[PDB]
Amino acid sequence: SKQSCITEQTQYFFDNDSKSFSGVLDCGNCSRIFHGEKLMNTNLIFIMVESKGTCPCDTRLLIQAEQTSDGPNPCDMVKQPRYRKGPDVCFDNNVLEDYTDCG
Amino acid sequence: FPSAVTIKSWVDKMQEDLVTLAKTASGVNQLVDIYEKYQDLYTVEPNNARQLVEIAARDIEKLLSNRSKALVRLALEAEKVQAAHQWREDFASNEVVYYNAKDDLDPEKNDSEPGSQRIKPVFIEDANFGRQISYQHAAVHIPTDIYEGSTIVLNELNWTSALDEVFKKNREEDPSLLWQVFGSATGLARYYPASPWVDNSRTPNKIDLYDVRRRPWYIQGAASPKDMLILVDVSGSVSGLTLKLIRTSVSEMLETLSDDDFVNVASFNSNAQDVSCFQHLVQANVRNKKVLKDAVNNITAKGITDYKKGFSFAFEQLLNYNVSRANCNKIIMLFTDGGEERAQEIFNKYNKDKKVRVFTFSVGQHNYDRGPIQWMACENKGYYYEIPSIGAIRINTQEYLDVLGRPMVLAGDKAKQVQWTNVYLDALELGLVITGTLPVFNITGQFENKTNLKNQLILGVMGVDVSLEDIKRLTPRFTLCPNGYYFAIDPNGYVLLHPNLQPKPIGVGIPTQEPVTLDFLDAELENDIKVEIRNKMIDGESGEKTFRTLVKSQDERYIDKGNRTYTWTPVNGTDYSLALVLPTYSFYYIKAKLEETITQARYSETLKPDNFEESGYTFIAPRDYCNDLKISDNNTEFLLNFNEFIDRKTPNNPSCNADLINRVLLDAGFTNELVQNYWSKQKNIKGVKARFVVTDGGITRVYPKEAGENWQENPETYEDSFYKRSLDNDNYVFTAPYFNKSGPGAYESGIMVSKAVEIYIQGKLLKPAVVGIKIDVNSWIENFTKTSIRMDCVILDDGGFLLMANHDDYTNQIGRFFGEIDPSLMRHLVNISVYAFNKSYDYQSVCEPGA
Ligand SMILES: *[C@@H]1O[C@H](CO)[C@@H](O[C@@H]2O[C@H](CO)[C@@H](O)[C@H](O[C@@H]3O[C@H](CO)[C@@H](O)[C@H](O)[C@@H]3O)[C@H]2NC(C)=O)[C@H](O)[C@H]1NC(C)=O
Ligand SMILES: *[C@@H]1O[C@H](CO)[C@@H](O[C@@H]2O[C@H](CO)[C@@H](O[C@@H]3O[C@H](CO)[C@@H](O)[C@H](O)[C@@H]3O)[C@H](O)[C@H]2NC(C)=O)[C@H](O)[C@H]1NC(C)=O
Ligand SMILES: *[C@@H]1O[C@H](CO)[C@@H](O[C@@H]2O[C@H](CO)[C@@H](O[C@@H]3O[C@H](CO)[C@@H](O)[C@H](O)[C@@H]3O)[C@H](O)[C@H]2NC(C)=O)[C@H](O)[C@H]1NC(C)=O
Ligand SMILES: *[C@@H]1O[C@H](CO)[C@@H](O)[C@H](O)[C@H]1NC(C)=O
Ligand SMILES: *[C@@H]1O[C@H](CO)[C@@H](O)[C@H](O)[C@H]1NC(C)=O
Ligand SMILES: *[C@@H]1O[C@H](CO)[C@@H](O)[C@H](O)[C@H]1NC(C)=O
Numbered sequence: 001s002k003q004s005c006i007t008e009q010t011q012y013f014f015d016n017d018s019k020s021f022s023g024v025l026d027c028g029n030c031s032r033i034f035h036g037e038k039l040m041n042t043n044l045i046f047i048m049v050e051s052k053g054t055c056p057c058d059t060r061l062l063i064q065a066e067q068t069s070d071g072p073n074p075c076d077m078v079k080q081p082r083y084r085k086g087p088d089v090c091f092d093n094n095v096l097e098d099y100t101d102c103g
Numbered sequence: 104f105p106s107a108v109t110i111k112s113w114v115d116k117m118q119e120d121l122v123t124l125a126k127t128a129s130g131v132n133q134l135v136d137i138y139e140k141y142q143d144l145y146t147v148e149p150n151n152a153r154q155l156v157e158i159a160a161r162d163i164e165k166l167l168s169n170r171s172k173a174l175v176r177l178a179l180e181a182e183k184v185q186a187a188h189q190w191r192e193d194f195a196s197n198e199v200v201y202y203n204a205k206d207d208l209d210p211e212k213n214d215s216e217p218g219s220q221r222i223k224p225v226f227i228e229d230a231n232f233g234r235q236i237s238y239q240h241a242a243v244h245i246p247t248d249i250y251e252g253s254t255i256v257l258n259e260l261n262w263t264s265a266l267d268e269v270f271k272k273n274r275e276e277d278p279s280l281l282w283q284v285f286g287s288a289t290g291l292a293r294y295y296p297a298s299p300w301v302d303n304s305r306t307p308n309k310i311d312l313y314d315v316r317r318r319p320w321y322i323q324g325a326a327s328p329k330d331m332l333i334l335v336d337v338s339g340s341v342s343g344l345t346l347k348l349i350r351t352s353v354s355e356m357l358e359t360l361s362d363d364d365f366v367n368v369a370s371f372n373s374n375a376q377d378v379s380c381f382q383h384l385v386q387a388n389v390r391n392k393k394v395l396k397d398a399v400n401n402i403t404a405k406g407i408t409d410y411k412k413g414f415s416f417a418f419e420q421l422l423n424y425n426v427s428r429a430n431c432n433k434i435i436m437l438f439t440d441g442g443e444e445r446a447q448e449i450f451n452k453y454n455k456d457k458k459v460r461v462f463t464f465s466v467g468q469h470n471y472d473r474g475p476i477q478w479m480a481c482e483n484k485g486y487y488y489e490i491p492s493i494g495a496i497r498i499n500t501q502e503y504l505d506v507l508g509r510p511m512v513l514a515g516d517k518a519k520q521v522q523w524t525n526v527y528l529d530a531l532e533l534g535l536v537i538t539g540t541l542p543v544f545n546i547t548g549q550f551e552n553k554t555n556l557k558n559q560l561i562l563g564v565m566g567v568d569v570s571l572e573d574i575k576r577l578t579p580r581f582t583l584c585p586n587g588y589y590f591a592i593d594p595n596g597y598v599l600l601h602p603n604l605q606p607k608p609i610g611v612g613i614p615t616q617e618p619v620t621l622d623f624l625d626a627e628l629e630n631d632i633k634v635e636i637r638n639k640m641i642d643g644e645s646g647e648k649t650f651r652t653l654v655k656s657q658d659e660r661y662i663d664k665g666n667r668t669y670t671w672t673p674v675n676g677t678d679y680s681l682a683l684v685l686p687t688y689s690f691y692y693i694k695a696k697l698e699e700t701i702t703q704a705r706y707s708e709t710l711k712p713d714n715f716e717e718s719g720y721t722f723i724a725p726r727d728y729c730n731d732l733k734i735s736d737n738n739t740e741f742l743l744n745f746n747e748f749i750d751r752k753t754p755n756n757p758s759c760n761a762d763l764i765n766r767v768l769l770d771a772g773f774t775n776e777l778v779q780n781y782w783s784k785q786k787n788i789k790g791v792k793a794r795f796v797v798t799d800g801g802i803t804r805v806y807p808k809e810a811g812e813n814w815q816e817n818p819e820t821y822e823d824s825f826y827k828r829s830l831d832n833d834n835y836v837f838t839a840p841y842f843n844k845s846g847p848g849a850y851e852s853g854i855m856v857s858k859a860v861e862i863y864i865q866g867k868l869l870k871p872a873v874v875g876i877k878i879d880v881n882s883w884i885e886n887f888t889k890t891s892i893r894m895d896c897v898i899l900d901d902g903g904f905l906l907m908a909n910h911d912d913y914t915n916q917i918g919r920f921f922g923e924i925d926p927s928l929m930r931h932l933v934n935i936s937v938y939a940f941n942k943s944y945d946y947q948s949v950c951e952p953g954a
């Protein structure tokens with residue numbers, strides 16, 4: 001029915017510790033004015049943008065969801081692979097071995 | 104555009120409104136008052152992380168050494184019994200009586216075989232295994248491709264009943280033992296708790312391809328780690344059927360490779376080249392094996408053959424020490440059909456002292472000369488296999504494993520050491536298990552030294568399952584904060600034990616019997632400090648490191664800037680390494696001291712599901728309160744059974760633990776004393792819709808009992824995303840509702856707002872509970888619409904989720920990601936760096952089957 005699958009996922013968070021962020025959005029051939037105020041003593045932000053019904057800049061979307069994807073390129077993570085310690089002891093090349101049994 | 108100060112004062116007014124509403128409705132400082140008032144009913148105990156880590160590490164070591172001693176006993180008896188066995192060919196009179204796991208439960212006498220009389224067992228139900236178990240004898244599994252009446256099989260069925268006795272005596276000494284099994288080198292598996300074969304007794308569409316000699320634990324115990332280099336021979340003559348068989352053989356040969364074995368696939372026709380993007384021996388993990396399989400399936404047959412140009416490539420790749428390797432058992436697998444070139448010169452030059460073996464396979468139904476192909480194996484320590492059709496694909500790889508285990512046998516008792524397997528799913532269903540393996544040698548001619556015909560092979564491999572639920576009881580997490588946990592690690596970095604390890608096969612790519620090997624860095628969010636900690640742990644040394652992390656939330660929608668302390672120690676006498684993650688506010692906890700025998704009662708009567716108006720609507724975390732209690736998903740049943748088992752608890756002194764029961768009863772008492780003395784006295788507020796509190800003890804009362812019908816949060820408080828989230832941020836957190844989730848929704852549920860209690864007991868900071876308010880959306884949109892509307896003044900949180908807008912249409916899609924509506928806004932915002940982000944993969948997530 002359903003199969004296991006590498007699914008790249010994204011999360012967002014307030015990068016800066018500042019509380020006020022203002023500017024003008026550089027939409028396609030238009031201008032969008034905004035002001036972001038982070039409410040104190042909470043995890044909420046107040047985005048005071050003043051532009052609606054203007055030209056559409058919705059070329060793509062930011063889909064924050066478990067989207068099906070291939071994994072990391074495995075041809076790249078074999079050049080500098082993660083640290084890894086193999087088994088300490090192994091048994092090969094014993095001289096008493098009987099080689100007369102090829103088949 | 105209003106001036107900055109104007110809307111800044113707007114924000115100040117709305118934020119003070121929200122803070123006042125939350126801290127007045129939930130009851131933060133009043134619950135703090137209760138907790139500091141009752142310092143006499145509990146004592147704050149420390150979580151000395153070093154002590155906890157060493158304690159759990161030595162407990163895990165003791166468990167693994169218990170199973171190691173069981174393996175030693177089983178292998179001792181197996182070798183001793185087989186050494187004292189006399190061959191036969193006449194089993195008509197001397198029956199071999201045994202239970203064949205693939206049998207019919209109906210009392211049908213005609214289900215038996217000429218040489219052997221079958222047992223009809225009596226199966227009882229055991230919840231330890233979850234299936235039908237009979238501890239009187241051991242079942243036998245015989246592959247469908249192997250006849251159960253031949254002489255080899257009947258002799259193996261004879262000398263393996265002392266194994267029945269030792270299985271029983273092993274389980275008597277350690278009642279907690281799971282499957283213990285002798286995986287015979289003739290194809291048999293003889294596992295002790297006799298249960299029917301897992302799903303393939305006699306069932307249509309369902310063919311039993313199980314073969315014990317192909318299992319990961321057998322392949323692990325049967326030999327040492329390899330360095331394979333599969334030389335496929337894609338020349339002209341192998342096209343047609345021979346090529347199809349060659350690619351199937353290569354896939355089924357890669358299937359016999361562990362994470363300790365290193366492999367590459369090359370292909371030669373008048374010039375040699377790799378088949379994939381790799382150019383050196385790469386580790387044979389799941390993803391690399393999948394890449395090699397996908398490259399082999401794309402291979403085409405064309406051109407003349409040059410054996411020297413292919414063997415030069417093979418040896419030159421096996422001499423590449425700049426890469427990480429398993430510096431052991433160097434091998435070359437030649438998947439040709441036949442030819443007239445021995446190439447004695449290339450073997451003489453490259454493989455002179457015979458460090459590298461050569462296994463030659465004559466794949467295909469053809470008539471070319473197999474003289475050089477049989478010679479290459481002889482001169483170079485190898486073996487020669489023939490794969491004329493699909494159906495001979497699956498045995499010859501098992502056979503090269505049979506060959507590789509000679510030098511392991513010739514090193515008599517140095518080689519008999521217990522090895523533990525990666526975390527795989529058990530054949531007979533019990534979920535994630537590791538298994539210890541011990542090879543069993545052939546001891547027929549010893550101290551009366553004889554010819555030693557086949558005394559270089561092994562008899563099989565012993566194996567005993569250890570379940571990952573057996574390990575999670577040696578590492579108890581209910582004295583820690585929910586953000587703290589234990590986790591272990593292989594020397595390959597794969598997590599043996601981790602809270603982000605779920606029963607389920609690991610994904611390897613986009614869809615069109617493998618181990619669940621989840622690396623450590625792929626189970627959490629990878630830092631550069633965490634890479635250092637991983638490399639420190641793998642080296643098997645102790646340490647400690649406190650630092651600031653990025654802790655993805657349990658619901659995989661937010662990220663917090665956490666503050667953790669990784670203490671770790673090696674598990675002695677084992678390759679593992681245990682670590683305990685612990686927040687800074689988690690160094691102390693509450694030990695409920697309720698020993699009056701009547702105080703526990705005076706707190707317990709308050710939990711009954713009839714008083715759900717003086718107190719709120721409660722849920723009980725389904726923990727191991729004690730063995731008589733059996734946890735269920737119907738939470739009201741658990742609450743009931745919990746109440747009855749509270750009713751008569753005094754006689755259960757040596758039965759079930761005072762810690763969890765006292766802690767939960769005390770938390771119920773503190774929660775009730777707040778629902779009575781601060782919420783029942785008020786009984787209603789306009790802005791709110793549901794006032795609730797959650798606690799680490801498991802008590803999660805919600806007041807109205809009607810909005811609690813819209814409460815879908817996990818009863819186990821140690822598994823709620825909002826609770827662990829609220830522990831981190833020392834402020835109020837708005838949990839945006841899940842967009843387009845059929846159920847309690849948003850309007851008839853609300854939006855969660857929560858804060859963590861911050862009590863001090865003798866100067867020790869604690870966070871025992873998080874009071875949460877499900878703010879009603881209508882009152883809040885009313886209080887918000889006293890602002891500018893039409894252009895849009897929106898409210899966003901961590902993760903950029905849409906709490907509401909002034910638009911009165913965005914609020915219809917309340918709880919959506921803001922990027923799904925007006926992406927340009929927060930794409931820009933990310934570029935201002937108000938919003939960072941992290942992309943991480945979840946290799947262990949279910950996925951729709953694409954085309
Ligand atoms: C939107 O509606 C009203 C205001 O429009 C908010 O309720 C009021 O919030 C203010 C905050 O500054 C309080 O003063 C108002 O009364 C207070 O109530 C607390 C309760 O303990 C008292 O201790 C104070 O002394 C004061 O009397 C309060 N009004 C009421 C009737 O409670 C409302 O919370 C807001 N909606 C949301 C969702 O936040
Ligand atoms: C462990 O090794 C011993 C010997 O090292 C194996 O026992 C030997 O097995 C062979 C082949 O099964 C026997 O040879 C056969 O003998 C019968 C009767 O003599 C004959 O009819 C056959 O044609 C064949 O020659 C041999 O007798 C037997 N015993 C000895 C002392 O060699 C034993 O099978 C090995 N363990 C396992 C599990 O196979
Ligand atoms: C996951 O998100 C975190 C957010 O903390 C990312 O870490 C941050 O990444 C940026 C970009 O690389 C770093 O900026 C650079 O930092 C260095 C040194 O601080 C500075 O000299 C440069 O000029 C630049 O500003 C930032 O430092 C870093 N933060 C931390 C705490 O390390 C991270 O990159 C994201 N991705 C992954 C895979 O973790
Ligand atoms: C492991 O053994 C060493 C020495 O034998 C000891 O110092 C260390 O404390 C042990 N670790 C644990 C967790 O017991
Ligand atoms: C190890 O085996 C002994 C049997 O002598 C048993 O009493 C003990 O509980 C076992 N230890 C563990 C951790 O299971
Ligand atoms: C092998 O079979 C004989 C004949 O039934 C029996 O006496 C003997 O006990 C068997 N060997 C073992 C190890 O049980």
Ligand SMILES: *[C@@H]1O[C@H](CO)[C@@H](O)[C@H](O)[C@H]1NC(C)=O
Pocket residue numbers: 401402403
């Ligand atoms: C792999 O498959 C693609 C698709 O048919 C093909 O173009 C390519 O040549 C193949 N690779 C090799 C090495 O032939």
Ligand SMILES: *[C@@H]1O[C@H](CO)[C@@H](O)[C@H](O)[C@H]1NC(C)=O
Pocket residue numbers: 423424425
């Ligand atoms: C490996 O490293 C050595 C020394 O850095 C270098 O001479 C050689 O070309 C490298 N590659 C191989 C395949 O040996």
Ligand SMILES: *[C@@H]1O[C@H](CO)[C@@H](O)[C@H](O)[C@H]1NC(C)=O
Pocket residue numbers: 649650651666687
């Ligand atoms: C832990 O948190 C405190 C305050 O939140 C911070 O000052 C400290 O640096 C953090 N710990 C570490 C190791 O950074």
Ligand SMILES: *[C@@H]1O[C@H](CO)[C@@H](O)[C@H](O)[C@H]1NC(C)=O
Pocket residue numbers: 737738739740
């Ligand atoms: C669970 O079972 C109990 C009793 O069997 C019942 O009262 C309750 O409604 C059930 N709940 C669900 C969600 O099935």
Ligand SMILES: *[C@@H]1O[C@H](CO)[C@@H](O)[C@H](O)[C@H]1NC(C)=O
Pocket residue numbers: 934
């Ligand atoms: C911001 O936008 C510019 C222009 O599109 C782009 O070049 C840049 O990479 C973005 N990010 C940063 C951090 O400058």
Ligand SMILES: [Ca+2]
Pocket residue numbers: 338339340341407408
């Ligand atoms: Ca050819």
